[PDB]
Amino acid sequence: NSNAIKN
Amino acid sequence: APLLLYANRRDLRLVDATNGKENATIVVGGLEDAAAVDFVFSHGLIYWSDVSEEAIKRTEFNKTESVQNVVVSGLLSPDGLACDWLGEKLYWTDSETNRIEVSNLDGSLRKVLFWQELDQPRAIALDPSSGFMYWTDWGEVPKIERAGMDGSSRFIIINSEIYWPNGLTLDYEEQKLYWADAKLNFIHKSNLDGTNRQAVVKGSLPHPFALTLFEDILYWTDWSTHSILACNKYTGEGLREIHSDIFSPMDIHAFSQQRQPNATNPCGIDNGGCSHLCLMSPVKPFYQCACPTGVKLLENGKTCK
Ligand SMILES: [Ca+2]
């Protein structure tokens, strides 16, 4: 999991 | 069960919580990366942020065919927003410029409220009648904070047992704050000052993003399940999936006039006698005059230089 909106 | 308004990157959608098996209706389409979403029910407005177009836009959902209107532009990463339906203001967070800002509903009179000690500000919730705003920050020092909607009296209300506070909502009837943590996999609640904290859903939430509430039911989007979930706001029981197979669920709200309870605007018809912005305030007389960024308020507390 990454929690950033953009990625 | 209310209607649920949610952003979906490529569009904004509306699904009936009592009938979530059906396909959601598309309220707005042709978006790039719609993330945050909110509304002003009485004005027939829906607002959203797009992190690719670096903007906040709005549409009039009571017009047969109303166009997308850019309200605020040049927002590097507008990860959260909230509509002040009482004072008629727009609040947002930017996780790249590390700021919290306010403007009028049309984007005029922009004013930066906080620009320090913000790392990954995300969710923002408003209690206009009490003049308080609440936000999460999932950065190096994760926290939940609150402050006057006029930028006054900032302070941290939660700073322990917290890592990825993504979702945040208010229960206006019970006077409680709810939030979802995506790293610790839970939903907790507390009083509005952060005291009397307790667990709602103890664990087992894969990656909750945004949280809303209606009557006795909590609703949230989950990035990993690509769905909207629900449970009882008191016990966390009755955990269930409402609406599934969502492309990329983002921010979410219970879409109802009841979630924006009518109240007297302390600004009156006078704009509080403020030359520019009349912001909600937590202390009597419950409004506070303010000016655009960099502009000074004169000695009378009403008139901008
Ligand atoms: Ca940052």
CA nearest B228: which of B59, B22, B48?
B22
- Rounded to the nearest angstrom, the distance between the alpha carbon of B1 and the centre of ligand 1 is 37
Give, in order, the Cα–Cα distances in Å from B221 to each of B31, B102, B121, B141. Answer: 19, 26, 18, 24
The residue with tokens 């209300």 is: B157
Contact of B130 with chain A, judged by CB distance below 8 Å, is answered with: no
Resolution (A): 1.9
B33 touching chain A per CB within 8 A: yes
Q: Is the peptide bond before B282 cis (omega within 30 degrees of 0)?
A: no
Q: Cβ neighbours of residue B166 under 8 Å, at least 6 residues apart?
A: A3, B122, B123, B136, B138, B180, B181, B182, B208, B209, B210, B211
Distance from CA of A7 to the nearest CA of B (A): 11
Q: Using CA atoms of B230, B231, B237, B240 in order, give the dihedral in degrees to the nearest 10.
A: -10
Query: Which residue(s) pair with B177 in the sheet?
Result: B170, B190
d(CA B92, CA B276): 19
Distance CA B298, CA B305 (A): 6
User: Which token pair is B145?
Assistant: 């904070």
Is residue B182 within 8 angstroms of chain A, CB to CB? Answer: yes
Which phi and psi (to 5°) does residue B100 adopt?
-120, 130
Q: Does the distance separating the beta carbons of A6 and B33 come in below 8 Å? A: yes
The answer for B 62-81 residues in CB contact with A (under 8 A) is 77, 79
Task: Report which residue type is found at B154.
Answer: R
Question: Residue B128 and residue B280: Cα distance in Å, rounded?
Answer: 6
* Token pair of B106 as six digits: 């049309």
B54: left (phi over 0), alpha (psi -120 to 50) or beta: left
Question: Out of A1, A5, A6, whose CB is closest to B207?
Answer: A1
Report which DSSP code applies to A4. -
List CB contacts (< 8 A) between B181 and chain A: none
Q: B285: exposed, middle or buried (C-beta count within 10 Å: 0-12, 13-18, 19+)?
A: exposed
Say if the Cβ atoms of A5 and B79 lie within 8 Å: yes
Q: Of B169, B94, B97, B185, whose CA–CA distance to B133 is shortest? A: B169
Chain B residues within 8 A of A3 when measuring between CB atoms: 138, 164, 166, 182-183, 207
Q: Is B17 on the interface with A (CB under 8 A)?
A: no
Asked if B288 is an interface residue toward chain A (Cβ–Cβ < 8 A), one would say: no
Pick the residue from chain B with its C-alpha nearest to A3: B164
- State the method: X-ray
Residue B26, beta-bridge partner list: B13
Parse chain B into domains and list their residue ranges: 1-259, 260-305
Residue carrying structure tokens 């610790």: B184
Which DSSP symbol is given to A3? -
Superfamily of segment(s) B1-259: TolB, C-terminal domain (2.120.10.30)
Query: How far apart are the C-alpha atoms of B32 and B247, rounded to whole Å?
Result: 13
Those residues with Cβ within 8 angstroms of residue B78's Cβ, 6 or more apart along the chain or in another chain: B35, B36, B49, B50, B51, B54, B55, B56, B72, B92, B93, B94
Tell me how far apart the alpha carbons of residues B292 and B295 are, in angstroms, rounded to a whole number.
Answer: 6
Please state which CATH class domain B260-305 belongs to: mainly beta
Distance between CA atoms of residues B79 and B34, nearest Å: 10
Determine how many CB atoms are found less than 10 A away from the CB of residue B136: 28
For residues B57 and B234, give the distance between their C-alpha atoms in angstroms, rounded to a whole number: 35
Nearest C-alpha of chain B: how many angstroms from A2?
10
Query: CA-CA distance, B257 to B245, in Å (whole number)?
Result: 28
Two structure tokens written together for B2: 């209310």
User: b or e along B28-67 (b: 16 or more beta carbons within 10 Å of the residue's beta carbon)?
Assistant: beebebbbbbbbbbeeebbbbbbbebbbbbbbebeeeeee
